[PDB]
Write an enzyme that holds these catalytic residues in place. Structure first.
Site, short mmCIF file in Angstrom:
data_model
loop_
_atom_site.label_atom_id
_atom_site.label_comp_id
_atom_site.label_asym_id
_atom_site.label_seq_id
_atom_site.Cartn_x
_atom_site.Cartn_y
_atom_site.Cartn_z
N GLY A 1 0.78 -1.24 0.00
CA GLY A 1 0.00 0.00 0.00
C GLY A 1 0.80 1.29 0.00
O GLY A 1 1.88 1.33 0.59
N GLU A 2 0.27 2.36 -0.64
CA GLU A 2 0.95 3.67 -0.71
C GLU A 2 0.14 4.78 -0.03
O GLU A 2 -0.91 5.16 -0.52
CB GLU A 2 1.34 4.05 -2.16
CG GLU A 2 2.56 3.28 -2.65
CD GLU A 2 3.29 3.74 -3.90
OE1 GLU A 2 4.53 3.90 -3.83
OE2 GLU A 2 2.63 3.90 -4.95
N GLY A 3 0.65 5.28 1.10
CA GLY A 3 0.06 6.36 1.88
C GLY A 3 0.66 7.73 1.56
O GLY A 3 1.41 7.87 0.58
N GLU A 4 0.31 8.75 2.38
CA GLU A 4 0.83 10.12 2.22
C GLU A 4 2.21 10.22 2.88
O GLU A 4 3.13 10.83 2.31
CB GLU A 4 -0.14 11.16 2.82
N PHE A 5 2.34 9.59 4.09
CA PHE A 5 3.57 9.49 4.89
C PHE A 5 4.63 8.67 4.12
O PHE A 5 5.64 9.23 3.67
CB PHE A 5 3.26 8.85 6.26
N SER B 1 5.09 4.16 2.52
CA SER B 1 4.59 2.98 1.82
C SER B 1 4.82 1.75 2.66
O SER B 1 5.65 1.77 3.55
CB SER B 1 5.31 2.81 0.49
OG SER B 1 5.04 3.90 -0.38
N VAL B 2 4.09 0.68 2.35
CA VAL B 2 4.22 -0.64 2.98
C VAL B 2 4.54 -1.61 1.83
O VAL B 2 3.90 -1.56 0.78
CB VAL B 2 2.97 -1.09 3.82
CG1 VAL B 2 3.22 -2.43 4.51
CG2 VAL B 2 2.61 -0.04 4.86
N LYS C 1 10.41 -13.71 5.38
CA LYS C 1 9.45 -12.79 4.74
C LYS C 1 9.05 -11.74 5.75
O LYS C 1 8.65 -12.08 6.88
CB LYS C 1 8.20 -13.54 4.23
N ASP D 1 -3.01 6.21 16.39
CA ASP D 1 -3.64 5.90 15.10
C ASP D 1 -4.34 4.54 15.16
O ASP D 1 -4.14 3.70 14.28
CB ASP D 1 -2.58 5.95 13.98
CG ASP D 1 -3.11 6.08 12.56
OD1 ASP D 1 -4.29 6.50 12.39
OD2 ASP D 1 -2.34 5.78 11.61
N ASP E 1 0.91 -0.32 13.24
CA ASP E 1 1.01 0.96 12.55
C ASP E 1 0.75 2.18 13.45
O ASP E 1 -0.15 2.99 13.17
CB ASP E 1 0.08 0.95 11.32
CG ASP E 1 0.54 1.79 10.14
OD1 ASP E 1 1.33 2.73 10.35
OD2 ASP E 1 0.09 1.52 9.01
#
Ligand code: S4E
Length: 270
Positions: free
Chosen positions: A19-23, A25-26, A39, A147, A165
Site C-alpha cells: 500500500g501507498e500512503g501520504e507518509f 509505503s508498505v 518474509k 492511530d 502501525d
C-alpha cells in the site's frame, strides 16, 4: 546505547508494494537475519531535520517498541536507516509479514463469497477482546497508539489480532478534544477504540455515513455520535458509547473495557 534496533541494510531485499500512503509505503521484503531468510513487512517514512535531534528521538521510540513483547501488540524486528536521493533520512521499520492481512479488509471480505464467510458474533467479540488486551498492555506502559483503527490491526497466523502501525509526534477516529486542542491522551485512544469497535460490529462500515470529513468537528460539537448498528446487542453498544463521552475524564480505562467484553463473550452460548 541500545543498537539492537538497527539492522544492516545489506541484509534486506525490497519487494512488491502492499500500500501507498501520504507518509510512506508498505511493502513485501526478505530479511537475511544464519544462512536462511525471512518474509517481512517494510514501512518506509521520510523524516525532517538533517541533524541528530529528530532521528535520535525516532531511534529512542523504535528501541521502546522493539523491547515490547505481547501476542496482541505487533513485534518490531528492527529499523534500517538509509539517506534518500534528496539528502533526507529514510527510516524503514521492519515487522513480521502478516499473510492474513489487516482486520478492516478481512471484515469486508467476510461479506463476499471468496475468502472468509459470515463471521459469527463470538468471533467478532474475540477480535475486540484481542485489541483491548493489546491496548491495555500499551497503557500500563504509558505508550499512546495515536492511530488506532481496523486498518491498523493485523491478523496473525493463529487468527489472533494484534495492534500495529502506530502514529508519531483521519478525522473520523480523532477524539472531540483532540480536534479542538490537538491534545492527545490515553482517553483519545479509548475514543479511537470505540470507533474501531463500531467498525467490527458493522463488519467494515466507514464511520458516520453521510457526514463529510470537513463537517465532523461541528457534528460532534452538537452531541452527535455513531448510531447503534442493526442486530447489535444493547449491552455491546453501551460499551462503545462510553468511549465517546464529551469529558475525557468520564471515559472508561482499557482494563475496564477488556473486562466488560470478556464478561459479555463468556455470557453468550459460544
Ligand atoms: C498482506 O498484506 C499486508 C501484510 C502486512 N503484514 C505486516 N504488516 C503490515 N502492515 C504494517 C505496517 N506498518 C506497521 O507498523 C509501522 C510502525 C512504525 C512506527 C510507524 N505495522 C504493520 C501488513 C500490511 C498488509 O497489507 C497492507 C494493505 C493491504 C490492503 N490495502 C491497503 C494496504
Amino acid at each position: 546505547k541500545l543498537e539492537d534496533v538497527v539492522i544492516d541494510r545489506n541484509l534486506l531485499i525490497l519487494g512488491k508494494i502492499l500500500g501507498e500512503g501520504e507518509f510512506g509505503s508498505v511493502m513485501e521484503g526478505n530479511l537475511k537475519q544464519d544462512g536462511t531468510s525471512l518474509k517481512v513487512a517494510v514501512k518506509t517514512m521520510k523524516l525532517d531535520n538533517s541533524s541528530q535531534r529528530e532521528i535520535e528521538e525516532f531511534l529512542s521510540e523504535a528501541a521502546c517498541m522493539k523491547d515490547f513483547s505481547h501476542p496482541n501488540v505487533i513485534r518490531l524486528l528492527g529499523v534500517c536507516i538509509e539517506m534518500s536521493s534528496q539528502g533526507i533520512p529514510k527510516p524503514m521499520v521492519i515487522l513480521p509479514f502478516m499473510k492474513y492481512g489487516d482486520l478492516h479488509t478481512y471484515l469486508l471480505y467476510s461479506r463476499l463469497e471468496t475468502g472468509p464467510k459470515h463471521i459469527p458474533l463470538q468471533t467478532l467479540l474475540k477480535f475486540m477482546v484481542d485489541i483491548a488486551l493489546g491496548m491495555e498492555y500499551l497503557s500500563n506502559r504509558n505508550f499512546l497508539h495515536r492511530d488506532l483503527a481496523a486498518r491498523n490491526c493485523m491478523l496473525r497466523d493463529d487468527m489472533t489480532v494484534c495492534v500495529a502501525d502506530f502514529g508519531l509526534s483521519p478525522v473520523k477516529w480523532i477524539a472531540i478534544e483532540s480536534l479542538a486542542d490537538r491534545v492527545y491522551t490515553s482517553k483519545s485512544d479509548v475514543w479511537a477504540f470505540g470507533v474501531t469497535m463500531w467498525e467490527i460490529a458493522t463488519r467494515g462500515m466507514t464511520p458516520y455515513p453521510g457526514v463529510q470529513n470537513h463537517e465532523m468537528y461541528d457534528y460532534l460539537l452538537h452531541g452527535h455520535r455513531l448510531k447503534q448498528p442493526e442486530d447489535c446487542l444493547d449491552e455491546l453498544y453501551e460499551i462503545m458509547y462510553s468511549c465517546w463521552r464529551t469529558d475525557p475524564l468520564d471515559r472508561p480505562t482499557f482494563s475496564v473495557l477488556r473486562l466488560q467484553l470478556e464478561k459479555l463473550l463468556e455470557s453468550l452460548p459460544d
